[PDB]
Structures are given as structure tokens and as C-alpha cells.
Amino acid sequence: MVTVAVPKERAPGERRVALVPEVVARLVKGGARVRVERGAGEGAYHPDEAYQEAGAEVVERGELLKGAHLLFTVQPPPEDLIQALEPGAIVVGFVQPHKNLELVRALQAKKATVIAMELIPRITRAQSMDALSSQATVAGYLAAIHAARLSPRFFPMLTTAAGTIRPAKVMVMGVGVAGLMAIATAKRLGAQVFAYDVRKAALEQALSLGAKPIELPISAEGEGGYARELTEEEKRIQHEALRDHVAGMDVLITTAQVPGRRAPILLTEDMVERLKPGTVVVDLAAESGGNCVLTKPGEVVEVRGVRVYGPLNLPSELSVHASEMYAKNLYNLSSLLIEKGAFAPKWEDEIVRAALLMKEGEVLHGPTKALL
Amino acid sequence: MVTVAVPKERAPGERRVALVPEVVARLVKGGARVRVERGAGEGAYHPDEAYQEAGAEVVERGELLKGAHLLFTVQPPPEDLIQALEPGAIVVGFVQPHKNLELVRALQAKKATVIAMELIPRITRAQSMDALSSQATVAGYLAAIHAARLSPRFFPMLTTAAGTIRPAKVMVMGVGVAGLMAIATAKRLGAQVFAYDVRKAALEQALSLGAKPIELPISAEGARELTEEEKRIQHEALRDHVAGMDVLITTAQVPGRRAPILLTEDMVERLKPGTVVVDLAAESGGNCVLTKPGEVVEVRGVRVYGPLNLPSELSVHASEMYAKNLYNLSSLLIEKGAFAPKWEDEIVRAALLMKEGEVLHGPTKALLG
Amino acid sequence: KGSLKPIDVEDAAVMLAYAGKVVFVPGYGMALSQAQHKLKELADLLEARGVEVKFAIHPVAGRMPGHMNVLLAEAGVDYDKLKDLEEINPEFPTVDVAVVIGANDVVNPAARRPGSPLYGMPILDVDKAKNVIVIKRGQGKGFAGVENELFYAENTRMLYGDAQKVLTELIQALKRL
Ligand SMILES: NC(=O)c1ccc[n+]([C@@H]2O[C@H](COP(=O)([O-])OP(=O)(O)OC[C@H]3O[C@@H](n4cnc5c(N)ncnc54)[C@H](OP(=O)(O)O)[C@@H]3O)[C@@H](O)[C@H]2O)c1
Ligand SMILES: NC(=O)c1ccc[n+]([C@@H]2O[C@H](COP(=O)([O-])OP(=O)(O)OC[C@H]3O[C@@H](n4cnc5c(N)ncnc54)[C@H](O)[C@@H]3O)[C@@H](O)[C@H]2O)c1
Ligand SMILES: NC(=O)c1ccc[n+]([C@@H]2O[C@H](COP(=O)([O-])OP(=O)(O)OC[C@H]3O[C@@H](n4cnc5c(N)ncnc54)[C@H](O)[C@@H]3O)[C@@H](O)[C@H]2O)c1
Ligand SMILES: [Cl-]
């Protein structure tokens, strides 16, 4: 009859919580115990009494992990919780080894078992558990909102007795889930939206939201979907064409990241230099370095009247709906950890196997081994 | 040759500019000379060379008013500009005596002539010149944008693998030009929008944009029937309709008066934590008691934003619309490139706040004593 | 097992002309086709003929969370017309015609079965409708790359074409009746 734990997050700017009241209520109706740190939900407007009314037990950090079989976290747990971990306990949450090397190294010493939410596989059974997608959706939405807030122009075409105003030209650079939602939200607002990505698939998906795919002289892709190794010559050409497309935009929303690497640069000093004063760059890749060379993580800078913003935790801004979706993701994942109220880790199950970063100090993820 | 002069706005945090280069070029082409203060359009991202390319003379501030018949301002002229005015010259801009009584007082002393842009009549005929309409549209747009930024919840409905996100319930209290644009923008973002006003016309306009009108019933044109039975009706009813809301955007204002308190304490106490209030009326007190003008506060998890000068945030399009409003008005001031004020016109008669120093607007005159 | 049974736009128009209850189920194909405005126009038209019209939105239809919602909202569809599958599933048996528009994986009965790659996906019971009309260009499979037994059911008929061109033609055919 398992007891699952949910802590108050500690990472800079983190206001999300791994489980919200309603989802905790169902886990308890389902016959599970839920230990929740004092005030873990307050960042997402879920007070301590809300969790009590859901059948959860609100306790102190340090007491949190006694008798606990499952740690459900948003960001990876700090040292103090890693020391509090018991034998057989499973850590479930984002881990992100490239940004949390020490916490991962520490997790070996205690020899804890961890399944990482970023490694939740992209197969149909795991769709309802896909935390990257849900959180990226929040980020993409807010990226567009912040873009409109920082821009000195209207997004929408406006016509009035005073005259006619063109819609803003927004380009989303990097079209994953965040990119798609950024497109969709800028499009609802009335902006003329353009899309840049190296994948034909991403570009088709951008077109399925009314965006105009930016098509460069050299196609970045070939048959098999393999990305072209571009010559230096070909590389000089893509850059110059993209520099020109980007120069004619009023807003750039950049979202390109690659698991385990610093964010690739999509806006270079020379490209930014060709942006008109008043232009706005909302750099979603700031959390892993930024696609824009001007970006200062966590800040809004303005250089040459180009306003560049590098937000670090957009999910934490939309904390209520971001938490709600994440909780459900974890709840759906708890399928493979809990059976009829019982601690039933299905190690056998692919979702567990693909996403299991560690098993009792043993590191199973290939790339995570290479880095450490 | 009529010379028009454009200053660098100097009021705290004002980034708009009265004319933008493209409007300057229309005037110059129509025969008018144009002088623009060094760096005037930098708040709206029009550099000096752009005004020069349009045919205007970019000059130093102390030089700005030599030979100029028309001074076009966004906010009222400061004293250094007031003093440099020639006889025969006419100041054209927002005046609003309440924020600037001592500058208005200063204008009558100098015996200057000024057209107040807030005294444009609110009729279809005048809408090309209507600076209140254009700038309120900007304000309403940015209100919704800010509401969405401050809310911890999605505006739109989203059906996802991780559950179904319901739309934000957004109530726009006070549906004038700002409010209606706030409805349209919240609607663009996927919110379910509700609309409250004391005037049925505003309610029909809001229905037409797809908002659900709130259940009335007062006419109050034009705090009239509002304070009939002293507005206990207003307070009573919406105390129920407000509690469901995720966002309240308030814009209610009455000319020359206190802005109505639509959000009392007992009312805000029923708002669920995470609720957002965007009080546009902050400039003349708030529609909400908790509003701290120019700031975001949070009490009991209710984020209350009292923005001042949203038009300045949208400096490019605010300036553009404003400049077009003036250009259009300038048709009643210029003849084939000649200084030809249309004293007779009923728009000029309504908006001419003073002439030769004498103050012609009743409510204003009264306040000068 | 069964068979692919093509239908003309005229044949589909007659089916919709006499339907009492119609459910639109849009997928990625609607979005690629940007057919949301024509689909809305069709829904308006059927309603004005007293047809009870609803939209079933699958949780993972399209290629991003809420893909169908953002497009349908763009086209002007009412939130009260958009039903999620727990609320609309039990209703399918009394649905005279379910018009599937550019959807495949989200209307595949195979997801009920544990062996199939689609197992885990919540199931939309469009196969329990009295008649199904599927709009897709031809033999293109969905994201998951599996074939659809729905397309082979006795009560399923295939309306081949680009989603918006088809819907446009359906509206014109229906206006003539
Ligand atoms: N929603 C999400 O967030 C998300 C993200 C990633 C993956 N997925 C997965 O993606 C799939 C979504 O399911 P779905 O039923 O919406 O799409 P789907 O199963 O990928 O099928 C799309 C169908 O659209 C038809 N089509 C394409 N273009 C068309 C056009 N112009 N006109 C008419 N039809 C057209 C295609 O066939 P033809 O070539 O014959 O026209 C194709 O069969 C699910 O497998 C979901 O698990 C979802
Ligand atoms: N769904 C997927 O297949 C997938 C794959 C990787 C990452 N992601 C995640 O999705 C989110 C969205 O980002 P994205 O993947 O849509 O960005 P993306 O598809 O645009 O790829 C990242 C960037 O890599 C650069 N790049 C790669 N090869 C290049 C080459 N040969 N020459 C020049 N440039 C090259 C491109 O500029 C590209 O924009 C990110 O958070 C990311 O972590 C998703
Ligand atoms: N051509 C046209 O027809 C045209 C164009 C633009 C504006 N106008 C009119 O100009 C007039 C003023 O517009 P504005 O945007 O400057 O208004 P405003 O800045 O004075 O804001 C007041 C708005 O809030 C409402 N309001 C005021 N007190 C309220 C209260 N106690 N409770 C609820 N709502 C309250 C008002 O009815 C009005 O709609 C309006 O009548 C508008 O219709 C007409
Ligand atoms: Cl803000």
C-alpha cells in the first residue's frame, strides 16, 4: 500500500509542484498514501489545507521521506532529499544531467533509483505521460504572450478611421512543441507568422497552423530525413539568406534546444545587427544557453533598440495549468509504478526501461554515462 | 508656408511622439515646413535621419519654436516650450487640466491658443481625428496581453493528452473603446469573455464581438441611475458574477470625476487565488480598491495591475495612430500649405480650450478659478 | 476482412441532408489542408437544417496539444460544440453520420487491443456510429504508420480528396438540396 512523496521545489524561480490536490485525491481514492512538504503547492496556488482535504499528509521536509517509496519531483531533488532516500525508493521527475551534474553524481552515492521525465519515450502508450510536451506547450504560449508584451507594435492587423496598420511579422525559430504553440498563439493574435526549422516535418506542422515556412536556397534535409552535412560554401549561403529573412521581422521567438548540449546559436552578432530598432527576440533556449548571442538568461536587455528577453522558467509563470498537466503526466505514469494501491514497479515495462536513468546507483542511460 | 513643430515628449516615461516621419512627409509634400526636436522620435524608434529624409528640419529644442505656427504635442507642453511660443501660434495635443493644471494655467498666462485632443466630440464624423479612440484601442489591446501574462492559467481551451484545459473566464468591466478592444484580444486568445457596462449600447457592441453581456439593469447615461438607490444594485449583482472570473479587466471612467469603484473589498475577497485584475482606470483612482497605480501587487493571491501609459508601451503604433489623428485634424488648420485655422468648424469649436489666453471650456475654466 | 468503399461528394451530401445527428471528428489532415473554415461553414449549414451537430476532439489529434482547438477556435466554432471523448463516446450509437476529417490514428479501433502499437491511446468510438464518412486524400497512413480497419467496416465510406476542396464541394452539393 505505497506512500508517494512530493517536495517543495527549490531550484531558482521554480513555482511548480509535482502533484496538485485533485490528482492527489485520486491517488488516495486509489488507495495510496501521499506525503507532501509544507507549502509545496503554494507556488501554484494550491494551499496546505487543499492537500489535507485530498487525504494527503502535510509534513516537514526531512520527515518527508520516511516510509516513502516514490519521490515525485518537478526539478531533480537537492542534496538534503537525496540523503533522505530509502532503499527501494524510486525518484521520478525531470533530471536533465547536463544541467544538474552534481545532483546526479550525488544520486549514485546514495544508490537511488531514478526515472527521468525527459526520457519518457515518444511512443503512444507514453503520450499522456509526456512532460516535455505539456511544459513546452506552456512555454510556447507564454513566449508569444511575452513577445506581444515587449513589442511596441500590434500583432493584429488593425483598420480604423485613423488608418490601416499591418500585422506584426513574427518568426518562430525552432518548431518543436513550444515552437508550434508559439506559432498558434501569435497567429490567434493576428500576427503574420513565419517558421524556420531544419526538418521538413516541423515545417509541415508549422504550415498546419497557418505559418509560412521560411525556405532557404539549400534544403537542410535529404531522403531518409538525414540532415545535410553542409559545406562551408553552402553554410555561408543559408546564413546570408536567413540573415535577410530574419532582418525583415518584428519578432523572433527562438526555441531550439538539443538534449545534453548547449543551445545552438540561430541569431549571430551579424544577424542581430541587421534587426531594426524596435524588434523583439524572445529566446526560449536561454535555459540551456540561448539561440541569440545578445541573450542574458533571466533578463530583458535592449541593445540598438533590439529588446532581447531570455526567460528561464515559463512553466513556473503559468504555474497553475503547468502544474496541473505535469501532475496528470505523473499520475498517468504512476500506472507503471502502482497497482491497485500497491508499490508495483514494472521494471519489465518499456516506459520504465527507456526512462530509467538509474537503478540503485547504477547508471543505465548511455549519454548520461558519457557526460559523467 | 505653415511651419509645424514637434517636441521631444518629456513627461515621466512617455515614449510617444506627436508626428512620425511618414506623416511629416505628407505635410511637407502638402506645402508645410516641419521642425522636429533632436531625438524626439527615439521612444518610438524614429531616429533623426528618418525625419530628415522626410523633409523636416531636425533642430535643437531652444530653436524648435522659431517661426512655428503649430506646436503638435502628445502630452501638454512644458513651460520651456510654453514660453518660446510665438503670437498667433496654436498648441495641439492632450491637455487634461487635472494632471497638468499648472501647465494649463501657464498657457493662459502666455496668452497662447490650444486645442485639447480630449475635447474631440465622440461621433462617427470625427473618428479620423479622435486621439482618445486610437489610444484607448492601444490600451485595451495591451490590457488583455498583460492579463494573459499575469495569469497562471491558459486563456484558450486546449484538449491535450495531459487533460483538457478549460478557457479563462474574462470579464471586461467598462466596455468603451478600450474595453471592446480588450474583449476582441481576450477572444482572439480563446478566453470566454463577459462584458459589463451601465449602457445598453456598450452591451450590444460587446455581444456583437462575442462576449456574454452581464445581467444589467441600469441605464446611467450620459453615475446617473448608477447612484439611484446609490449603486447598491451594481455592487449586489456582480458580487456573484465576478467570483467565477479568472481575469477582471476594468476600464470604467466618468469625465472630470472619480473613477467608479467596481471592485470593493467584500467583492475581491470572493476571487480565487491566481485571479488577475487589470485596472486600466488607475490614472483617475482605480475601479479596484487594491490598485496601486503603476504597480503589480498581490494580496491573498489576487494580482492587481494598475498600468499607466500603455500607449507609451506600444510606442510605434500609438505614435503612428496619434500622428494620423493630428494629420487629419490638421486639415482643419492648413490650406494648401498655409496657416488657415477653421475657427468656424464644429470640431474646432468643441475642442478649442483657449484663444489669445482666454479660456473657453466650462469645466476647465471653473477649475482655474 | 472487409473492403474500401469510395463515395462521391454527392452521395455524402444526401447522407448528411437526411441525418438527424452528425459528429465531426477532425485530425491532422484538416490542419494540413487548413480546412477549418469550410468545416465550420458545413456545421453552420447542417444546423440551419435542424441537424444536431457536434465536434469530438481527440486528446492527441493533430501534432500539438490542442491543435484542433486552436484551428476550430480560429474558424469560429463554439466551445459548447466541442466535446471531449468521455462526454461524447456513449453518444456515438445514436449518431447517424460521423464525418471524419483528416483523422486516422485517433479513430482507429486497433487501440483497444493490447498487441497494437496504438494501445494506451484513449479510444474514440466513431466505429459505433451508424455511418462513417472518412475524408482523406487516399492511402496515406497516420503518424503511427498502421492501417485502419475502420476504413474497412460495413458502415464506413471513403470520401477521397483534399479536406477543404471536399468540404467546399459538400457545402455546394448540400445547398442544391
Ligand atoms: N496532438 C499531438 O500533440 C501529437 C504530437 C505528436 C504525435 N501525435 C500522434 O499523431 C497522431 C494524430 O492523429 P490524427 O488522426 O489527427 O492524424 P494521423 O493519424 O497522423 O493521420 C492524418 C491523416 O490525414 C490525412 N491527410 C493529410 N493531408 C490531408 C489533406 N490535405 N486533406 C485530407 N486529409 C489529409 C492523411 O492521409 P492522406 O495522405 O490519405 O490524405 C493522414 O491519414 C496520433 O498518432 C498522435 O498519437 C500527436
Ligand atoms: N521532436 C523531435 O524530434 C526533437 C528532436 C530534438 C529535440 N527536440 C526538443 O524539441 C524542442 C524544440 O526544438 P527543435 O528540435 O524544434 O529545434 P530544431 O528542429 O530547429 O533543431 C535545432 C537546431 O539545430 C540546428 N542544426 C542542426 N543541424 C544543422 C546543420 N547541419 N546546419 C545548420 N544548423 C543545424 C538548426 O538550426 C535547428 O534549428 C527542444 O526543446 C528540443 O529539446 C525534439
Ligand atoms: N463613432 C462612434 O460611434 C464612437 C467611436 C468611439 C467612441 N464612441 C463613444 O465615446 C464614448 C466614450 O468612450 P470612452 O472609451 O472614452 O469611454 P470612457 O474612457 O469614459 O470609459 C467609460 C466606459 O466604461 C463604462 N462605464 C463607466 N462607468 C461605469 C460604471 N459605473 N459601471 C460600468 N461601466 C461603466 C462607460 O459606459 C464607457 O463604456 C462612448 O459612448 C463610446 O461609445 C463612439
Ligand atoms: Cl506585466
What's the rounded Cα separation, in Å, for the pair B333 and B323? 15
> How far, rounded to the nearest angstrom, does the alpha carbon of residue B208 sit from its chain's CA centroid?
23
Chain B residues close to C68, C-beta within 8 Å: 159
Contact C60 B161 (CB under 8 A): yes
What's the rounded Cα separation, in Å, for the pair A313 and B356? 59
3-state percent helix, strand, coil for chain B, nearest multiple of 5: 35, 20, 45
Cell triple for residue A139? Answer: 512555454
How many A from CA of C140 to the centre of ligand 1?
9
What's the rounded Cα separation, in Å, for the pair B329 and B200? 31
Q: Smallest Cα–Cα separation from B71: which of B89, B84, B55, B58? A: B89
Angle at B225 (CA atoms; ends B220, B226), nearest 5 degrees? 85
Cell triple for residue B251? Answer: 476600464
φ and ψ of B285, to 5 deg: 75, -175
How many A from CA of B290 to the centre of ligand 4?
16
Residues of C with CB under 8 A from a CB of A: 28, 31-32, 34, 59-60, 62-67, 70-71, 73-74, 111, 117-122, 144
β-sheet bridge partners, residue B296: B305
B159 min Cα distance to partner chain C (Å): 5
Cell triple for residue C124? Answer: 474514440
What's the rounded Cα separation, in Å, for the pair A74 and A318? 14
Question: DSSP secondary-structure letter at B4?
Answer: E
Chain B residues close to C61, C-beta within 8 Å: 159
φ and ψ of C6, to 5 deg: -60, 150
Q: Smallest Cα–Cα separation from A68: which of A36, A40, A41? A: A36
Verify cis geometry, omega within 30 degrees of 0, for the bond prior to B217: yes
Ligand 3 contact, B216 CB (< 6 A): no
Residue A128: how many other CB atoms lie within 10 Å: 22
β-sheet bridge partners, residue B114: B91, B354
What's the rounded Cα separation, in Å, for the pair B343 and B346? 8
β-sheet bridge partners, residue B30: none
β-sheet bridge partners, residue B247: B170, B276
Question: Closest Cα to atom 9, ligand 3: which residue?
Answer: B122
Q: Pseudo-torsion of CA A285, A288, A292, A293, nearest 10°?
A: 170
How many A from CA of B229 to the centre of ligand 3?
22
What letter represents residue B46's amino acid? H
H helix count then E strand count, chain B: 13, 19
Tell me whether residue A46 is exposed, middle or buried, using C-beta atoms within 10 angstroms of its C-beta: 0 to 12, 13 to 18, 19 or more. buried
How many A from CA of B302 to the centre of ligand 4?
14
- Give me the helix-helix angle, B177-188 and B131-150, nearest 10°: 40
Ligand 1 contact, A208 CB (< 6 A): no
A122 annotated ligand-binding residue: yes
What's the rounded Cα separation, in Å, for the pair C61 and C44? 22
Touching subunits of A (3+ CB pairs, under 8 Å) are B, C
**CA distance readout (Å), A141 to A178, B101, B184, B302:** 7, 44, 18, 22
Which ligand is located closest to the Cα atom of residue B303? 4
Tell me whether residue B45 is exposed, middle or buried, using C-beta atoms within 10 angstroms of its C-beta: 0 to 12, 13 to 18, 19 or more. buried
Test the C interface: residue of A120, A122, A123, A124 with most C CBs within 10 Å: A124
What's the rounded Cα separation, in Å, for the pair A357 and A135? 20
Residues of B with CB under 8 A from a CB of A: 44-45, 47, 127-128, 130, 133-134, 137-138, 141-142, 145-146, 148-149, 151-154, 156, 158, 160-163, 165, 185, 188-190, 272-274, 301, 313-317, 320-321, 324-325, 328
Test the B interface: residue of C67, C68, C69, C118 with most B CBs within 10 Å: C69
What's the rounded Cα separation, in Å, for the pair A117 and A261? 18
Name all domains of chain B by residue range, CATH numbers in brackets.
3-138+314-357 (3.40.50.720), 139-313 (3.40.50.720)
SS3 sequence of B172-198: EECCCHHHHHHHHHHHHCCCEEEEECC
Q: Smallest Cα–Cα separation from B309: which of B42, B99, B5? A: B99
Q: Which domain holds residue C134?
A: 1-177
β-sheet bridge partners, residue C26: C101
Strand A300-303 and strand B192-196: pairing?
A: unpaired
Sole residue written with cell 507568422? A193
What letter represents residue C136's amino acid? K
Cell triple for residue B261? Answer: 469603484
Verify cis geometry, omega within 30 degrees of 0, for the bond prior to B222: yes
B23: left (phi over 0), alpha (psi -120 to 50) or beta: alpha
φ and ψ of A159, to 5 deg: -125, 130
Question: DSSP secondary-structure letter at C112?
Answer: G
Pocket of ligand 1, candidates A123, A127, A134, A175: which has the most ligand atoms within 8 Å of its Cβ, to mutate?
A127
Q: Smallest Cα–Cα separation from A180: which of A160, A156, A197, A198? A: A197
What's the rounded Cα separation, in Å, for the pair C75 and C46? 16
**H or E element at residue B115:** strand B113-116
A199 annotated ligand-binding residue: yes
Q: Smallest Cα–Cα separation from C100: which of C22, C153, C18, C174? A: C22
CB B240 within 8 A of CB B99: no
CB B183 within 8 A of CB B209: yes
Question: Could you give the number of structural domains in chain C?
Answer: 1
Question: DSSP secondary-structure letter at B76?
Answer: P
CATH number of the domain at C163, please. 3.40.50.1220
Sole residue written with cell 489535507? A52
Q: Nominal resolution in Å?
A: 2.4
Beta-carbon pairs below 8 A across chains A and B: 118
Which runs of E-coded beta strand occur in C3-161?
A: 21-26, 52-57, 82-84, 97-101, 132-136, 156-160
Structural determination approach: X-ray
What's the rounded Cα separation, in Å, for the pair B196 and B185? 16
CB B286 within 8 A of CB B293: yes
Residues 6 or more apart whose CB falls under 8 angstroms from that of C16 comprise C22, C46, C51, C97, C99, C170, C174
**CA distance readout (Å), B51 to B19, B33, B313, B330, C29:** 10, 12, 22, 19, 50
Q: Pseudo-torsion of CA B310, B314, B317, B320, nearest 10°?
A: 70
What's the rounded Cα separation, in Å, for the pair B342 and B349? 9
**CA distance readout (Å), A100 to A80, A94, A162:** 15, 10, 54
**CA distance readout (Å), A198 to A170, A213, A231, B36, B214:** 18, 11, 16, 47, 49
Cell triple for residue C28? Answer: 491532422
CB C153 within 8 A of CB C2: yes
CA end-to-end span of chain C, whole Å?
36
CB A138 within 8 A of CB A100: no
SS3 sequence of chain A: CCEEEECCCCCCCCCCCCCCHHHHHHHHHCCCEEEEECCCCHHHCCCHHHHHCCCCEEECCCCCCCCCCEEECCCCCCHHHHHHCCCCCEEEECCCCCCCHHHHHHHHHCCCEEEEHHHCCCCHHHHHHCHHHHHHHHHHHHHHHHHHHHCCCCCCCEEECCEEECCCEEEEECCCHHHHHHHHHHHHCCCEEEEECCCHHHHHHHHCCCCEECCCCCCCECHHHCECCCCHHHHHHHHHHHHHHHHCCCEEEECCCCCCCCCCCCECHHHHCCCCCCCEEEEHHHHHCCCECCCCCCCEEEECCEEEECCCCHHHHCHHHHHHHHHHHHHHHHHHCEECCEECCCCCCHHHHHHEEEECCEECCHHHHHHC
